[PDB]
Curated annotation (Swiss-Prot):
One of its GO terms (cellular component) is cell outer membrane. Belongs to the calycin superfamily. Lipocalin family. Involved in the storage or transport of lipids necessary for membrane maintenance under stressful conditions. Displays a binding preference for lysophospholipids. Homodimer. One of its GO terms (biological process) is DNA damage response. It comes from the Bacteria. It comes from Escherichia coli (strain K12). GO terms for molecular function: lipid binding. It is found in: Cell outer membrane. Keywords: Cell outer membrane, Lipid-binding, Lipoprotein, Membrane, Palmitate, Signal. This is Outer membrane lipoprotein Blc. It is a lipid-anchor. The keyword 4Fe-4S does not apply. Induction: By starvation and high osmolarity.
Amino acid sequence: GVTVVNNFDAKRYLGTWYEIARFDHRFERGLEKVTATYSLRDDGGLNVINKGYNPDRGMWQQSEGKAYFTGAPTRAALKVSFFGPFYGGYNVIALDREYRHALVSGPDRDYLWILSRTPTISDEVKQEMLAVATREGFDVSKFIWVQQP
């Protein structure tokens, strides 16, 4: 398993985040400029809007999904959909005290994201997001560093 952030405030997670990096998720194979955006739902899930420029297809592609805590809402263990009502693990495995940066793992170890409120981050944060990813047993060399202006 993976350690998950265990004192979570969901309302502080809302708004836009930048895909600072990912693994080669072959549902986003070849999207640049990526963002995820979270909004609270009447049911207590989140709505998710993933947006990515196609740099080669001169296009913007985007899907909507939802996400639900699979346990206690103060624990960053969730399930997310991306294309229909088809869900996979979404675990926040590193999150700063102020919600600028996040490392999020997916359904297994082929799925990993770095996220940030800001379109780029330093290395004191970028290499620190890897130290945790390495600690949780991920292969940080898999990271595609998604491009942001």
